[PDB]
Amino acid sequence: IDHKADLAVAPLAITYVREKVIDFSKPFMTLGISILYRKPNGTNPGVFSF
Amino acid sequence: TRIVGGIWWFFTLIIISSYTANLAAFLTVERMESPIDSADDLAKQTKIEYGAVEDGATMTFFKKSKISTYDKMWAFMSSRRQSVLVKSNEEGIQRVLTSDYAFLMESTTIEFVTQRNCNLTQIGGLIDSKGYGVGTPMGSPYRDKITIAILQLQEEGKLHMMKEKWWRGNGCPEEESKEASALGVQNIGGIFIVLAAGLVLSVFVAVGE
Amino acid sequence: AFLTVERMESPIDSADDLAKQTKIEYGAVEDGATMTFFKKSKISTYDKMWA
Amino acid sequence: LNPLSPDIWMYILLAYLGVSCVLFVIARFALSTRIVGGIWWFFTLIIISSYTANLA
Ligand SMILES: *[C@@H]1O[C@H](CO)[C@@H](O)[C@H](O)[C@H]1NC(C)=O
């Protein structure tokens, strides 16, 4: 706010207000919100699966 | 000998029909359900808990989202704020690990985590438009100099290597990508083993006499 | 076909099985604080149950 | 051939050849014949049922 940090580097999603007050540079990295899940384990019933 | 042969044949037909019907039902119910939940479409599911970091970027995005797929997710998260929402990223990862719970988080953090440990997966991805970059509160020219540095940095190959070595970490075991619907070796090999056992027992009892 | 039909449905109906199915009926008190929660707080499966 | 993986078809072909060879050996060299027929019939039962179920 008081311009005591000339360069601002951090994980910062380019939001509407942030672009409104900071003319942000071109995006270093393109990304978005993703969903997370546990890997589905393979329920092996053994060799005698029939 | 006619009656016994006929009844044995009828019994064989009934047994093979029942076995095939039951196996077909089992495989059909296995294949009908997707191995994962509906990718990025946890609506109409309401069984796997899902949420994001409390008052985070994903939480804020889902608050101001009017898409039919995401407004239902926001309503579910708000109705269960004390349960699905978590304070920190590591808390969310632990909650996903400990119980049936899906988490919504920035893509770079998801890939970083799923590369750190391979007991976790990233289902969809890039369902939101955002990016990371440096900034300057004033309309200075040196930020534009930084932007031209960005473009000249991507014009040659240096970003990918440093990005990967910062996310590679430890090795991850190989996993399937496009495996078909054929039976696995472990799925059927039992009949092969029992056939071999029966054959060797028959050979032994034949050579015994 | 018979076994697939009788195995496709979840043997124990849950908070999602009832919404997708129609054979089993469900209901509650007429606006007895149950469907008042159903009409608002639009959750996909809960919206299906409310409808 | 989608329901059965190619290695399974390798195994099926080699099992057929092996059962044929062992039957020829037994004939060259009837309870044992009955047991061999029964185990081969059971193997055919399981393989046809698995193929039918998966393809269904
Ligand atoms: C393995 O998968 C089953 C099937 O959904 C489920 O119990 C859970 O996701 C896993 N169980 C573990 C890791 O004990």
Curated annotation (Swiss-Prot), chain B:
Q: Which residues lie on this side of the membrane: Extracellular?
A: 28-187
Q: Where in the cell is it found?
A: Cell membrane; Postsynaptic cell membrane
- Binding annotation for L-glutamate: 57-58, 106
Entry PTM: Sumoylation mediates kainate receptor-mediated endocytosis and regulates synaptic transmission. Sumoylation is enhanced by PIAS3 and desumoylated by SENP1.
Q: At the top level of its lineage, which domain of life is listed?
A: Eukaryota
**Which tissue types show expression of this protein?**
Highest expression is found in the olfactory lobe, piriform cortex, dentate gyrus, hippocampus, granular cell layer of the cerebellum, and in caudate-putamen.
- State which residue ranges cross the membrane: 7-27, 188-208
Question: Subunit structure, briefly?
Answer: Homotetramer and heterotetramer with GRIK5. Tetramers may be formed by the dimerization of dimers. Assembles into a kainate-gated homomeric channel that does not bind AMPA. Can form functional heteromeric receptors with GRIK4 and GRIK5. Can form functional heteromeric receptors with GRIK3. Interacts with DLG4. Interacts with NETO2. Interacts (via C-terminus) with KLHL17 (via kelch repeats); the interaction targets GRIK2 for degradation via ubiquitin-proteasome pathway.
Misc. comment: The postsynaptic actions of Glu are mediated by a variety of receptors that are named according to their selective agonists. This receptor binds domoate > kainate > quisqualate > glutamate. It does not bind AMPA without coexpression with GRIK5.
Q: Which family does it belong to?
A: Belongs to the glutamate-gated ion channel (TC 1.A.10.1) family. GRIK2 subfamily.
The function of this protein is:
Ionotropic glutamate receptor that functions as a cation-permeable ligand-gated ion channel, gated by L-glutamate and the glutamatergic agonist kainic acid. L-glutamate acts as an excitatory neurotransmitter at many synapses in the central nervous system. Binding of the excitatory neurotransmitter L-glutamate induces a conformation change, leading to the opening of the cation channel, and thereby converts the chemical signal to an electrical impulse. The receptor then desensitizes rapidly and enters a transient inactive state, characterized by the presence of bound agonist. Independent of its ionotropic glutamate receptor activity, acts as a thermoreceptor conferring sensitivity to cold temperatures. Functions in dorsal root ganglion neurons.
Q: Could you identify this protein by its name?
A: Glutamate receptor ionotropic, kainate 2
User: Gene name on record?
Assistant: Grik2
Indicate the span of the full protein covered.
633 to 841 of 908
Swiss-Prot record, chain D:
Q: What is the annotated quaternary arrangement, including any partners?
A: Homotetramer and heterotetramer with GRIK5. Tetramers may be formed by the dimerization of dimers. Assembles into a kainate-gated homomeric channel that does not bind AMPA. Can form functional heteromeric receptors with GRIK4 and GRIK5. Can form functional heteromeric receptors with GRIK3. Interacts with DLG4. Interacts with NETO2. Interacts (via C-terminus) with KLHL17 (via kelch repeats); the interaction targets GRIK2 for degradation via ubiquitin-proteasome pathway.
Location comes to:
Cell membrane; Postsynaptic cell membrane
Family affiliation: Belongs to the glutamate-gated ion channel (TC 1.A.10.1) family. GRIK2 subfamily.
| Other remarks in the entry | The postsynaptic actions of Glu are mediated by a variety of receptors that are named according to their selective agonists. This receptor binds domoate > kainate > quisqualate > glutamate. It does not bind AMPA without coexpression with GRIK5.
Which gene produces this protein?
Answer: Grik2
Q: What is this protein called?
A: Glutamate receptor ionotropic, kainate 2
What tissues express this gene product?
Highest expression is found in the olfactory lobe, piriform cortex, dentate gyrus, hippocampus, granular cell layer of the cerebellum, and in caudate-putamen.
Q: Which residues cross the membrane?
A: 7-27, 39-56
Q: How is it modified after translation?
A: Sumoylation mediates kainate receptor-mediated endocytosis and regulates synaptic transmission. Sumoylation is enhanced by PIAS3 and desumoylated by SENP1. Ubiquitinated. Ubiquitination regulates the GRIK2 levels at the synapse by leading kainate receptor degradation through proteasome.
Summarizing the function annotation, the protein's role is: Ionotropic glutamate receptor that functions as a cation-permeable ligand-gated ion channel, gated by L-glutamate and the glutamatergic agonist kainic acid. L-glutamate acts as an excitatory neurotransmitter at many synapses in the central nervous system. Binding of the excitatory neurotransmitter L-glutamate induces a conformation change, leading to the opening of the cation channel, and thereby converts the chemical signal to an electrical impulse. The receptor then desensitizes rapidly and enters a transient inactive state, characterized by the presence of bound agonist. Independent of its ionotropic glutamate receptor activity, acts as a thermoreceptor conferring sensitivity to cold temperatures. Functions in dorsal root ganglion neurons.
Q: Which organism is it from?
A: Rattus norvegicus
